[PDB]
């Protein structure tokens, strides 16, 4: 079966492509506690239909470009920028960790 | 093509072949598609040839070619007996 993943659109910044963030809980091999971990998929949105913060199912599919091998299947749950802002702060923090620091 | 033939499996001076179906291009003792029988040419035990004529015939029915002895062994375990 073509793998189907469910995630959150965190990018509209391209044409006919949305970036989906897909989490996955699983117990850790050695230490056992259940760890989150998540990966961004570039997904194909030909209609620029899905918006920033939509929750979408994504489907394994024939290549559309480098990076793009999934197309956006159905809409699951409409808007929610909580997950986005979450992901947004995550990336913003990167500003601090380097050789310098201050007021981000 | 794809062959029915013997693969060597005994030891030095102690030969036992496996009657196997394989792409003719593998090494003789390499990964095969399917074993369908075995063969001790020394007749050391009373059970020294075994085949399974159903699979033997299946493969034939899709034009696996037997070797000049696989066909020989096959025959002897009545693969080709049609009466």
């Amino acid at each position: 079966p073509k793998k189907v993943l469910t995630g959150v659109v965190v990018s509209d910044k391209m044409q006919k492509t949305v970036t989906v963030l897909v989490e996955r809980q699983f117990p850790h091999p050695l230490y056992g506690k259940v760890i989150k971990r998540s990966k961004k998929y570039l997904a194909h949105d030909p209609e620029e239909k899905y918006k920033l913060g939509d929750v979408v199912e994504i489907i394994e599919s024939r290549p559309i470009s480098k990076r793009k091998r999934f197309r956006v299947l159905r809409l699951v749950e409409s808007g929610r920028m909580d997950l986005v802002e979450k992901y947004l702060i995550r990336r913003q923090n990167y500003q601090s960790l380097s050789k310098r620091g201050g007021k981000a | 093509m794809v062959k029915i033939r013997l693969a060597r499996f005994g030891s030095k001076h102690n030969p036992h072949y496996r009657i196997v179906v394989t792409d003719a291009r593998r090494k003789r003792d390499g990964k095969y598609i399917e074993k369908i029988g075995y063969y001790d040419p020394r007749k050391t035990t009373p059970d020294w040839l075994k085949v399974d004529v159903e699979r033997a015939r299946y493969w034939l029915s899709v034009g696996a070619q037997p070797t000049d002895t696989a066909r020989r062994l096959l025959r002897q375990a009545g693969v080709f007996r049609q009466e």
């Binding site: 117990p27 056992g32 506690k33 259940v34 | -």
Partner: protein, 138 residues
């Protein structure tokens, strides 16, 4: 705010027994309740009860010990010698029905929550289920 309330209860108990109290209040929750039910069945506690210490609901647990002994230090033998949390928050511990613990060669229980309810090690073995290994008691 108690981080793990199942463990606070397993402990409250352990602390009470170790100084031979009569009974002890643990704040109420169906789940805690669901557990004590088992402790009773297997005889580790005389019983539990839904008392009400000032407005909010507790579970009076009544403890059971041994008889008095002879020698220096008479203090009776605990019926609950040992009672420990197996699965804790930030390290959950689930076992399949094939790997449910044999506790003390069975002179003791292990309590696991399953989709068929809170059960003992032998209870889940019959029913043919695993779940979340909550604690061993023996």
């Amino acid at each position: 705010m108690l981080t793990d309330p199942i463990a606070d209860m397993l402990t409250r108990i352990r602390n009470a027994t170790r100084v031979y109290k009569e009974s002890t209040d643990v704040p109420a929750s169906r789940f805690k309740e669901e557990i004590l039910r088992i402790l009773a069945r297997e005889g580790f506690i005389k019983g539990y009860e839904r008392v009400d210490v000032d407005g909010k609901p507790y579970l009076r647990v009544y403890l059971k010990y041994g008889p008095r002994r002879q020698g220096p230090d008479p203090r009776p033998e605990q019926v609950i010698h040992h009672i420990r949390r197996i699965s804790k928050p930030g390290r959950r511990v689930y076992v399949g029905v094939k790997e449910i613990p044999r506790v003390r060669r069975g002179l003791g229980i292990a309590i696991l929550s399953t989709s068929k309810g809170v059960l003992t090690d032998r209870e889940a073995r019959k029913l043919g289920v695993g779940g979340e290994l909550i604690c061993e008691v023996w």
